[PDB]
Ligand binder design. Structure first.
Ligand SMILES: *[C@](=O)([C]([C][C]1[C][C][N]C1=O)[N]C(=S)[C]1[C]2[C]([C]N1C(=O)[C]([N]C(=O)C(F)(F)F)C([C])([C])[C])C2([C])[C])C1=NC2=C([C]=[C][C]=C2F)S1
Ligand SMILES: *[C@](=O)([C]([C][C]1[C][C][N]C1=O)[N]C(=S)[C]1[C]2[C]([C]N1C(=O)[C]([N]C(=O)C(F)(F)F)C([C])([C])[C])C2([C])[C])C1=NC2=C([C]=[C][C]=C2F)S1
Ligand SMILES: [Zn+2]
Ligand SMILES: [Zn+2]
Lengths: 303, 303
């Protein structure tokens, strides 16, 4: 069949929006759209401030001219500045000529997006991620990655959904929407902070099992069926999110392509949860994958 | 630490080179660099021809004007055509204004590259791949993906190494360099064709174990050491490629960063091969990964 990979959106349209933002000695990435530059507000922090910053007091000591915005090897002139939640917005004199059509969106737990990991305003790599149920992501991010953004592409329109801010003690990642509001309960200070218990995104697992069937990987299809409540009792036990009839409906395309009822596919999933995989693999994986949505599977398997 | 993901190069520079190529009713992707368009030569085939095509006889019945090259919603004029091995080269009247600095390279088994999967000359997604020892790739590719290219980025320079041509009966993929020479023993006809036995890329597995240590995942570090020959006897048995002193030397960076000798890391790998992973995971994987090179691990873990 198609084969199967974690695929990212083409990053060109976003590459044209990345810039370097410096304030004193701190440098990080910003996003230049029309005549506004968006970056994390803790660009105005030193190493000292980050333990418990008073962002309003810190920002008061800053002027337009304390902010050094550079695009390639070319400076921009900052003519205004405002803090919106955990984001700084810098008004510059020049509209980005490379600006794409774009929206800002706040995504839901379980949805996926592409990340363009950047350093010093320069793009380094692109990868695909999911917003975990506990509003963390499992990214790859070094010092200086802050202000890197996540996004989806509709057709000609880029929907920006994420800006990178921090790594939590567990080694997973947290950040904001493009209005500066954190996903999850996190704040932008250097303090011990815990995410909750994470859960598996059941509907995504089901989508990936449909992708497996479509590619010819069918060993795990068992001989039973189940009920929503029956499945959901089992899901509880294994830390899977509960499946609803919304989820059933969203899987309708894959269900109809394959001729396999959602509840039958749920029956096969139960048995995998209770019996394990016993050394076999599925689409070359020894674990159950939950970071492809139903939409993702449809794009890559059907086109 | 960083975290760890299959990361692709940013695709923008390549997005600017993709075009649609049509001959009669067949359409596929081409690459527009300066005033040449490169595509697979079987663009000139119908469904009938593909069983056993005589490419020279087929191409003889074609003129410049039988070739419809379209970039966005804009036609180009074809003023010359030549077959180079399994590639068609079309001379057009217009130099690509978006052409990047570029080379054509023929990569070695075990090396990685990014693929920009395209349909109708339009980019759909980007993912990272390895050239298997038997010169196949495990891609994700639908009808119409042919002429999609693989590449690496040096700094400002794109090194094109792969053009997509076919899916083999096992559901893996084969194709050419940008001069039209197949990787592996494949030919461009619809016939049963077998790749050899594939093998694990041992040096890549070792690189990934170093990445694990760097991220704090250290459970598998055992208490022994080994010799190259000792390791290589064990490798033979499990279908791993033999490790050489070249490979030892290439791992020197990761070895020196971590303070763990290659041969000690080999000792840990042997035990994993003989004892298995026993339900544990490494960088969230239940299998041993062989599609990150030493260079790849250094970029993502050190930067
Ligand atoms: C960013 O680029 C980094 C990105 C971070 C570096 C390591 N992996 C990453 O994703 N973000 C940092 S330095 C943030 C900022 C302070 C502390 N912090 C952390 O990520 C921090 N995490 C926590 O304290 C947490 F609450 F437990 F999550 C550590 C311990 C992992 C360092 C902020 C304000 C939360 C940025 N770099 C700088 C920024 C501002 C000023 C100077 C920088 F160098 S933002
Ligand atoms: C391409 O876009 C496809 C890509 C292919 C479609 C399914 N997965 C893919 O990667 N390539 C095709 S149609 C090639 C071409 C003929 C047969 N073939 C195959 O990939 C073929 N494989 C074999 O016969 C093999 F030898 F076993 F590997 C199948 C059975 C998988 C179909 C070529 C010349 C080898 C292209 N599409 C067209 C092309 C040319 C003309 C018309 C097309 F529609 S190239
Ligand atoms: Zn999934
Ligand atoms: Zn590897």
């Amino acid at each position: 069949g198609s084969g199967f990979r974690k695929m990212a959106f083409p990053s060109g349209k976003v590459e044209g929006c990345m810039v370097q933002v410096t304030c004193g000695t701190t440098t990080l990435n910003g996003l230049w759209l029309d005549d506004v530059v968006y970056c994390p507000r803790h660009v105005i922090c030193t190493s000292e401030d980050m333990l418990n910053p008073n962002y309003e007091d810190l920002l008061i000591r800053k002027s337009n001219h304390n902010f050094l915005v550079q695009a390639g090897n070319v400076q921009l002139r900052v003519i205004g500045h405002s803090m919106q939640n955990c984001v700084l917005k810098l008004k510059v004199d020049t509209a980005n000529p490379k600006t794409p059509k774009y929206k800002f969106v706040r995504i839901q737990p379980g949805q996926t997006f592409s990340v363009l990991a950047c350093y010093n305003g320069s793009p380094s790599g692109v990868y695909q991620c999911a917003m975990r149920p506990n509003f963390t992501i499992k990214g790859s991010f070094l010092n200086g990655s802050c202000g890197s953004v996540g996004f989806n592409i509709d057709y000609d329109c880029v929907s920006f959904c994420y800006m990178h801010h921090m790594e939590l003690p567990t080694g997973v990642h947290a950040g904001t929407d493009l209005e500066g509001n954190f996903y999850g309960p996190f704040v932008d200070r250097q303090t011990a902070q815990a995410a909750g218990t994470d859960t598996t995104i059941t509907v995504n697992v089901l989508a990936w099992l449909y992708a497996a069937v479509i590619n010819g990987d069918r060993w795990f299809l068992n001989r039973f069926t189940t009920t929503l409540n029956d499945f959901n009792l089992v899901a509880m036990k294994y830390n899977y999110e509960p499946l609803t009839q919304d989820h059933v409906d969203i899987l309708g395309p894959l269900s109809a392509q394959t001729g396999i009822a959602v509840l039958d596919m749920c029956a096969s999933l139960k048995e995998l949860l209770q019996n394990g995989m016993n050394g076999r693999t599925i689409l070359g994986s020894a674990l159950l994958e939950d970071e492809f949505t139903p939409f993702d599977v449809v794009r890559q398997c059907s086109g």
